[PDB]
Amino acid sequence: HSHGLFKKLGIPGPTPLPFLGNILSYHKGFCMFDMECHKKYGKVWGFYDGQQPVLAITDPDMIKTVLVKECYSVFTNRRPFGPVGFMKSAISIAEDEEWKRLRSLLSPTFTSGKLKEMVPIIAQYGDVLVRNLRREAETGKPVTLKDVFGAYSMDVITSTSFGVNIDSLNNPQDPFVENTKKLPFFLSITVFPFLIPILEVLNICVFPREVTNFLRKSVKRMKESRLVDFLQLMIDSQNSHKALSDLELVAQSIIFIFAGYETTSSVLSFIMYELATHPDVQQKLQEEIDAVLPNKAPPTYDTVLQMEYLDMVVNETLRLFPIAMRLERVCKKDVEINGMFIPKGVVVMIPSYALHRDPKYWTEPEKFLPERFSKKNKDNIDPYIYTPFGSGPRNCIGMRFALMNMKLALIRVLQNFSFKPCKETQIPLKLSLGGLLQPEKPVVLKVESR
Numbered sequence: 001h002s003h004g005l006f007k008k009l010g011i012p013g014p015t016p017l018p019f020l021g022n023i024l025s026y027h028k029g030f031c032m033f034d035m036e037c038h039k040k041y042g043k044v045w046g047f048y049d050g051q052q053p054v055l056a057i058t059d060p061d062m063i064k065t066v067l068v069k070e071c072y073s074v075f076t077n078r079r080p081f082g083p084v085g086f087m088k089s090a091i092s093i094a095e096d097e098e099w100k101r102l103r104s105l106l107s108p109t110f111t112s113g114k115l116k117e118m119v120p121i122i123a124q125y126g127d128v129l130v131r132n133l134r135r136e137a138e139t140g141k142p143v144t145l146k147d148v149f150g151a152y153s154m155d156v157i158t159s160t161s162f163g164v165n166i167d168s169l170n171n172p173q174d175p176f177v178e179n180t181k182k183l184p185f186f187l188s189i190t191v192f193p194f195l196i197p198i199l200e201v202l203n204i205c206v207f208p209r210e211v212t213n214f215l216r217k218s219v220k221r222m223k224e225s226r227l228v229d230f231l232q233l234m235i236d237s238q239n240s241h242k243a244l245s246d247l248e249l250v251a252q253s254i255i256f257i258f259a260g261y262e263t264t265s266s267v268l269s270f271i272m273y274e275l276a277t278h279p280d281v282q283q284k285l286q287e288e289i290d291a292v293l294p295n296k297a298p299p300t301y302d303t304v305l306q307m308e309y310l311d312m313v314v315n316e317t318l319r320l321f322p323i324a325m326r327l328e329r330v331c332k333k334d335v336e337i338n339g340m341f342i343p344k345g346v347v348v349m350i351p352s353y354a355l356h357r358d359p360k361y362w363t364e365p366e367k368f369l370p371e372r373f374s375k376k377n378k379d380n381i382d383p384y385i386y387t388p389f390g391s392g393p394r395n396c397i398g399m400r401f402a403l404m405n406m407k408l409a410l411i412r413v414l415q416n417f418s419f420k421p422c423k424e425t426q427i428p429l430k431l432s433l434g435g436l437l438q439p440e441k442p443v444v445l446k447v448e449s450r
Ligand code: HEM
Pocket: 091, 092, 093, 103, 255, 256, 259, 260, 263, 264, 267, 318, 323, 324, 327, 328, 387, 388, 389, 390, 391, 392, 393, 394, 395, 396, 397, 398, 399, 401, 402, 403
């Protein structure tokens, strides 16, 4: 029973139950459990997901040591989850030097400059987003934002990943919309992670085996046709590391879809919940959007980077709702960091959500206050506490793309509409008690036309 480990190391934490460990304690969610451990235990604690020891760490130096200083040597991979099948080749899932290769091959895809070329295609769908919003706006009926934002998120994806171009909300069941639609179990992994190789030998998959088979073929539909977008950029690359294979490109595409789809849509919904429940911040943003882009002029790459308040609204939103919730690295070797022994196989965990709401680093942390990210105040913000995109060599590769995409949505939408709360709006919003950082009730708000 692996449940003596922290107890030996002199590291504190909750007593595990046989077999389940501390998972019973997840009934309020990952987040509330992390906060309560933090406030009960201080700078470090340990717990067991089943038999898996997990060590939480909250010292910023120690966090930097783990995420950055000792990344390639010790804290290189994430907690293995499965069964993944061919998606083991996905970059977010791959390990050790197999990953170091993929990161290299896929990096220039995400540069400052390549993102600059991607904006005019993201624009044409900002319009779509607005005319989609208008036909819901002139019909005075509260709007579920995950739906209209989700549709925009997806529109960006298929063009930026494959050059495909659809009006998904309206324009129909396109041969591409319904596969990507397959966009309770994942807990019972952890009492039984010895069953992963069982499923992995039953060829089952957490990526529905028909979606992938479609993209696997739909991507190999797009390849031999050409012979602007991620596919392009990846394909152009395979012309020091071995070039990207053919099933590898598919799995990365899948990861880009998974990554971008329910992230862009959900943050955008959080931002509009906050903007609507704070009518004044919406006002200041709408002023900035008009002083920079007068006469509803179309946003650009450089004018997006110019909007400082827009950036403050985005950053603070992700402080309250960091959708990763936690960052995790597998300790791959017996190791000591900043005066603490961490033994092999331990999963080291950084409770991002809990650290973003710590009253010790943040005043009024449950309040939404975009002035903490002002040039005046922004300096006092430890980048190893605020880590909505991770840090170090393994942080979110799509960071600059995520931000640009979202801001482009916001600017366009805020140029035509203000957003009020509605009687069905959940005030105060509540996080889905499950494993995902989404709201319980979906965000429904009033939309008006300026
Ligand atoms: C609001 C949007 C997003 C947020 C807040 C976000 C945040 C994060 C975080 C916290 C991580 C883990 C970082 C770490 O472990 O240190 C991550 C990983 C990752 N993200 Fe994002 N992400 C977003 C969107 C995207 C998008 C649009 C892409 C598009 C390609 C993307 C691609 C990835 C990949 C590939 C990884 C894993 C990278 C690796 O393991 O090398 N993400 N993201």
